[PDB]
Design a protein around this nucleic acid. Structure first.
Ligand SMILES: [Mg+2]
Ligand SMILES: [Mg+2]
Ligand SMILES: [Mg+2]
Ligand SMILES: [Mg+2]
Ligand SMILES: [Mg+2]
Ligand SMILES: [Mg+2]
Ligand SMILES: [Mg+2]
Ligand SMILES: [Mg+2]
Ligand SMILES: [Mg+2]
Ligand SMILES: [Mg+2]
Lengths: 177, 136, 51, 76, 116, 94, 60
RNA sequence: UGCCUGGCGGCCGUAGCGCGGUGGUCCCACCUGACCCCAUGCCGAACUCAGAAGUGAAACGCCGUAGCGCCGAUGGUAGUGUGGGGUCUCCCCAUGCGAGAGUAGGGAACUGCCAGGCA
RNA sequence: GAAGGUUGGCUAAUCCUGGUCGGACAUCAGGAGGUUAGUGCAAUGGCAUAAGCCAGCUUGACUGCGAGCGUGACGGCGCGA
RNA sequence: CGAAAGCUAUUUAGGUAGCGCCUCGUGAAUUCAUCUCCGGGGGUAGAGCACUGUUUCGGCAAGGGGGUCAUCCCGACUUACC
C-alpha cells in the first residue's frame, strides 16, 4: 500500500496527540472497505447483476460476491435466495489502493461535487457514502456504459465514536463539507 | 360490556370455583367493594353495578374494576336435544371467590363511597362488604 | 401420490433387483446407484428399470 | 360437529424406573425428542427410545450446564 | 470470538471420546507454542504432557511455533507415553483443523509409536 | 408505646393454627438478628384494635413473652380474606 | 487472493491536467488521463444579495 | 511452599450480567508478513503458514463493588391421603403429608490433575 | 438420489443508526437482542455437541441375522446393541 | 366355590369371537398382599405470570385518525382524540 505508509507515519502520531491515547492500538484504524450494488432489476434480467458485478470488478479489482435476498419480499417480487446485489470486501493493500483511487480520482469526477457529509457516520465511527453514477471512476469506460449504476461505499474502522472516525478520515484529507 | 377483544379458544370447560380469592387488598384507591360470597359475575351485572356507582358519585373521583369476565358461557337453544356438540357462547362471566376486591374508588368521601357501593351491590348476585385500604 | 415405483436391476447378470420410487416428471434421468448384490456378494452398479 | 377425531395413544413414558435391574436391550423410556438424554451404557434410538446397552441398574441424574436429565446404566 | 468458536467446534468430538472411554491425546496450539497432553478417560488426570514451553524441547528448536516444533512435541509426547505403556490413544484436535502444525504433531506421535 | 402480651406456641401446623384462631388467638413469628425465630400466640381482639391505628405499622413495638421485653417492628400481616380479622403477623427484631 | 478469477489488476499511470501523476494499480489495461484530480478541484482546495443587484443597475 | 499463567476436567447462576480498577519477565491476546502448506461461494476477516518489532487498546485473566440476575429460611397460608361431619355448586373437624409466592437473610463461586514463569 | 450417509465449516427473529437509484420492507456496514428464528407439511415433545444453515466426497435408502425389550385379544406393529 | 354387564373386533351394536372376571385339576418360586425403610420418574391439586394468550390502572409514550395554520416540497397546529 501507499496510504498505509501515510497512516503509519503521520496519522497515528497526529491522532495520538489529539486524543490523549495510551497505546498505538487505541488509535482508530481503517479495517475494511465494502462496496455493494443493489441490482434488484436483476428480477427482470439476470444479465443486469452480471453487468453490475463486472462494473464492480472493474472498479475494485477483485471479483464480487453475489448476494441473495435474505427473505421472500412481496414488495419487490423477490424470493428468499434470489440474487439482487453484489459486494466486495477490500482489506489491506487493495483497500488502501482503492482509498487512494477514490479520494484522488473518483470524488473529483462527481457532478456538482461540493464535499461529502460528516453526519454520514453510523454512530460508531463507520462512514458510508453513495455514488449516483459509476463513471466517477476512471476504471469504468464511458463509450460502452450499458446502463447508469451507482454503488454504496462503507468504511468500517476501529474508531469507537463518530468523532474518532471523522478525525481519522480527515487525517487523509477526506473531502468533508 | 366487558369481554375479551379476542381469545385463543371459543369455548371453555365448565370447571369449578373452589378456593379463596387473589387480590384481597384495595390496591389502587382508598375504598373497595369486596366479595364475601362465591359465584359468577356476568358482564351485564358488572356493567349495571358500574353504572350505579358512577351515577351516585356524579362521575367524580376515579373508579377501578378489578374483575374482568374472561370466561365464555355457552347455552343450548330452546327445543334442542342433548348432545350434537357444545352449545353456543351466550355471555361472559368472571369467577369470584370470597375475598375478591370487585371495584375500587378514590377521590370521594368515605360516606359517599359507601352509598355508591351500596347502590352498586344491589345489582350483584353475591354478598359483599365495604373495605378500606390498609397500611399493610 | 405421483412418485412411481421402479426397480434397480443388478449389473452383475444375477437378476437381483431392489425397488424404490421416483419423481419422473422432475428427475427423468435414469437412476444409478452402487448397491450390494447378494447373489455375487459384491457391491456393483445398479440401474433403473421398469417395475 | 367439526370435531370428533383423535389418534391412538402411543404408550410413551418410563418403562423401568430408577434402581431397576435390566438386561441389555431393555427399553428404559419411550419419548418424543430427547426429553431424557442417554448416559453411560445407554443408547438412543431413531425414535429417541433410550435402551440399556449393558446389564445393570437404571440411574436417573441431572448434569451439564443445561441441567438436563440423563439416564445411565450402572453395571452390576 | 475465536476461542469460543473453537471450543464449540471441539465439543462434539470431545463428548464422543468421553462416551467411548478413550484415552485422549489432546493438542493445544497458539501462534507461539504447541502442547500435547495424554488425558485419562475420566477427563481430569494427565498421564503425559509435552510442550514447547518446556526447555528440554525448546532448547533444541529454532522457533517454538512452527511445524518442526510441532513434530518435536509429537515425538516427545509419544515416547513419554510409550515409556508409560499407554500405546493406544484417540486424537483430539481441540477444534483446530487437522492440518499443518497439529497434523505434524499427530504424524510424529504416530511414527514414534502411538496408536491412532 | 404499643405493648403486646404474647405466649410461646406449644404446637405448630395447620390444625394448631386453626385451633388458635377458633379460640380468639392467632399465631405470629418474631425473626431477625442471630437469635432463632420465636413463634408466639397473640390475643386477636387486642392486637386487632391496636393495629387499627397506623402508628402500629411504623413505630417500634414491644412484645412481652413471659416477662421478657422484645422490641420489634411489624413486617407483614396476613389478613382474613373477608372478615375484619388477623391471621398471622411477622415481627422483625429491631 | 484466488487464482484466475480476478480482473487483471496491474499498476497503471494516471496524469492530471495540473501536472499531477499518480502511479496506480487499477483494472483498466491502458493508462489514465483525467481532467480534475484531488489537488485541482474547487472543493478540495476550498474554492466552492438584492441591494447590490438593485444598485448595480441603479447608479442614482 | 506461596503469587501469576496455560491446558483438561469436576460443578452447573451463592458460580451469570452490570459498574470500576488492574496485569505483559513468562504465558495469553491482539500483532507482523504471506508466491508459498492451506483458505475466501469476494476479501490472509476467518481458516492456514512463516515469525516476534509493537501493545495490553480490545479480548482475556484477576481484584473490588449489590444496580440486577441467582440462592433462601422460620412462621403462616393453599392443596391433599385416611376417618368423621355440615348450612353439601362449597366447606369443616381429627390425624398424616404440606406447597407456590413472599419476608428475614445469603451472595461478587468452590475445586482435582498436569505444565510453565517468579518468589 | 438429496431434503439420505459422512467429513469440515456455520448460527437465528426483530429493531435501531449510516448508505445510489431504493420506498414500510431488497442488497451493504455497524450496534442492540439472544432463538422472540428455523424444522419439506398439523400439533406436541425435542433440537447449539445443534435435529437449524453451507460445502466436499458419496449410496448404509446395504444383504443375511439378532441378545434383549416395548406395545397389542389376535393378525400384527415398534425399539435394538 | 362363585362371576360379568368391561377391552378389542365384527353389515357390529339386545348376536358372536379372543382377552378380562368364575370354576375344577396339576405344578412351581419368600410367588403375592398389607406396613416400615430405601431407590425412582412425574407436571395433576395448589401456585404463579418469564413464556403463549387474555386483563385493568399509573408513568413514559413509537405513534397514527380527525381541525388550525402555513402550503410547489415543505413546516408549524390542536386534539373529545385514540
Ligand atoms: Mg387437616
Ligand atoms: Mg494473522
Ligand atoms: Mg485493557
Ligand atoms: Mg417455599
Ligand atoms: Mg463480576
Ligand atoms: Mg457436522
Ligand atoms: Mg442431516
Ligand atoms: Mg363365598
Ligand atoms: Mg340382536
Ligand atoms: Mg389450578
Amino acid at each position: 500500500a501507499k496510504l498505509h505508509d501515510y497512516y503509519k507515519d503521520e496519522v497515528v502520531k497526529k491522532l495520538m496527540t489529539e486524543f490523549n491515547y495510551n497505546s498505538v492500538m487505541q488509535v482508530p484504524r481503517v479495517e475494511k472497505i465494502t462496496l455493494n450494488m443493489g441490482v434488484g432489476e436483476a428480477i427482470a434480467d439476470k444479465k443486469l447483476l452480471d453487468n453490475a458485478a463486472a462494473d464492480l470488478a472493474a472498479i475494485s479489482g477483485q471479483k464480487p460476491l453475489i448476494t441473495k435476498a435474505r427473505k421472500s419480499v412481496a414488495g419487490f417480487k423477490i424470493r428468499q435466495g434470489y440474487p439482487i446485489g453484489c459486494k466486495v470486501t477490500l482489506r489491506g493493500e487493495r483497500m488502501w489502493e482503492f482509498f487512494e483511487r477514490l479520494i484522488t480520482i473518483a470524488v473529483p469526477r462527481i457532478r456538482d461535487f461540493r464535499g461529502l457529509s460528516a453526519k454520514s457516520f453510523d454512530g460508531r465511527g463507520n462512514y458510508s457514502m453513495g455514488v449516483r453514477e459509476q463513471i466517477i471512476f476512471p476504471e469504468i469506460d464511458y463509450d460502452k456504459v450499458d446502463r447508469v449504476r451507482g454503488l454504496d461505499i462503507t468504511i468500517t474502522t476501529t474508531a469507537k465514536s463518530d468523532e474518532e472516525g471523522r478525525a481519522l478520515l480527515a487525517a487523509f484529507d477526506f473531502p468533508f463539507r | 360490556m366487558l369481554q375479551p377483544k379476542r381469545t385463543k379458544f371459543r369455548k371453555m370447560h365448565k370447571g369449578r370455583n373452589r378456593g379463596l380469592a387473589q387480590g384481597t387488598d384495595v390496591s389502587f384507591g382508598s375504598f373497595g367493594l369486596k366479595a364475601v360470597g362465591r359465584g359468577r359475575l356476568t358482564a351485564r351485572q358488572i356493567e349495571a353495578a358500574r353504572r350505579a356507582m358512577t351515577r351516585a358519585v356524579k362521575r367524580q373521583g376515579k373508579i377501578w374494576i378489578r374483575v374482568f369476565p374472561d370466561k365464555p358461557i355457552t347455552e343450548k337453544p330452546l327445543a334442542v336435544r342433548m348432545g350434537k356438540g357444545k352449545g353456543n357462547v351466550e355471555y361472559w362471566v368472571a369467577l369470584i371467590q370470597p375475598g375478591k376486591v370487585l371495584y375500587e374508588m378514590d377521590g370521594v368521601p368515605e360516606e359517599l363511597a359507601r352509598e355508591a357501593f351500596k347502590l352498586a351491590a344491589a345489582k350483584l348476585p353475591i354478598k359483599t362488604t365495604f373495605v378500606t385500604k390498609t397500611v399493610m | 401420490g405421483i412418485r412411481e415405483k421402479i426397480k434397480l436391476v443388478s449389473s452383475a447378470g444375477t437378476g437381483h433387483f431392489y425397488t424404490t420410487t421416483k419423481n419422473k416428471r422432475t428427475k427423468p434421468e435414469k437412476l444409478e446407484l452402487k448397491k450390494f448384490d447378494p447373489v455375487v456378494r459384491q457391491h456393483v452398479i445398479y440401474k433403473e428399470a421398469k417395475i | 360437529t367439526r370435531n370428533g377425531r383423535d389418534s391412538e395413544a402411543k404408550r410413551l413414558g418410563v418403562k423401568r424406573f430408577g434402581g431397576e435391574s435390566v438386561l441389555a436391550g431393555s427399553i428404559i423410556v419411550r419419548q418424543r425428542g430427547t426429553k431424557f438424554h442417554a448416559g453411560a451404557n445407554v443408547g438412543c434410538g431413531r425414535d429417541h427410545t433410550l435402551f440399556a446397552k449393558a446389564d445393570g441398574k437404571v440411574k436417573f441424574e441431572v448434569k451439564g450446564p443445561k441441567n438436563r436429565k440423563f439416564i445411565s446404566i450402572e453395571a452390576e | 470470538d475465536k476461542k469460543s468458536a473453537r471450543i464449540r467446534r471441539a465439543t462434539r468430538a470431545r463428548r464422543k471420546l468421553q462416551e467411548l472411554g478413550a484415552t485422549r491425546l489432546v493438542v493445544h496450539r497458539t501462534p507461539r507454542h504447541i502442547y500435547a497432553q495424554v488425558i485419562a478417560p475420566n477427563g481430569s488426570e494427565v498421564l503425559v504432557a509435552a510442550s514447547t514451553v518446556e526447555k528440554a524441547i525448546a532448547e533444541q528448536l529454532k522457533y517454538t511455533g512452527n511445524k518442526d516444533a510441532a513434530a518435536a512435541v509429537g515425538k516427545a509426547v509419544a515416547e513419554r507415553a510409550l515409556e508409560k505403556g499407554i500405546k493406544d490413544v484417540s486424537f483430539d484436535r481441540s477444534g483446530f483443523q487437522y492440518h499443518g502444525r497439529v497434523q505434524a504433531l499427530a504424524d510424529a506421535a504416530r511414527e514414534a509409536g502411538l496408536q491412532f | 408505646m404499643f405493648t403486646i402480651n404474647a405466649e410461646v406456641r406449644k404446637e405448630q401446623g395447620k390444625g394448631a393454627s386453626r385451633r388458635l384462631r377458633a379460640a380468639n388467638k392467632f399465631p405470629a413469628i418474631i425473626y431477625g438478628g442471630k437469635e432463632a425465630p420465636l413463634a408466639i400466640e397473640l390475643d386477636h381482639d387486642k392486637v386487632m384494635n391496636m393495629q387499627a391505628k397506623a402508628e402500629f405499622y411504623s413505630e417500634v413495638l414491644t412484645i412481652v413473652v413471659d416477662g421478657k421485653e422484645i422490641k420489634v417492628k411489624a413486617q407483614d400481616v396476613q389478613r382474613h380474606p373477608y372478615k375484619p380479622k388477623l391471621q398471622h403477623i411477622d415481627f422483625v427484631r429491631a | 487472493m484466488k487464482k484466475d478469477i480476478h480482473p487483471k489488476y496491474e499498476e497503471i499511470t494516471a496524469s492530471c491536467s495540473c501536472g499531477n501523476v499518480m502511479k496506480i494499480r487499477s483494472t483498466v489495461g491502458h493508462d489514465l488521463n483525467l481532467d480534475v484530480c484531488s489537488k485541482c478541484h474547487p472543493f478540495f482546495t476550498g474554492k466552492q444579495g438584492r441591494v447590490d443587484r438593485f444598485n448595480k443597475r441603479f447608479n442614482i
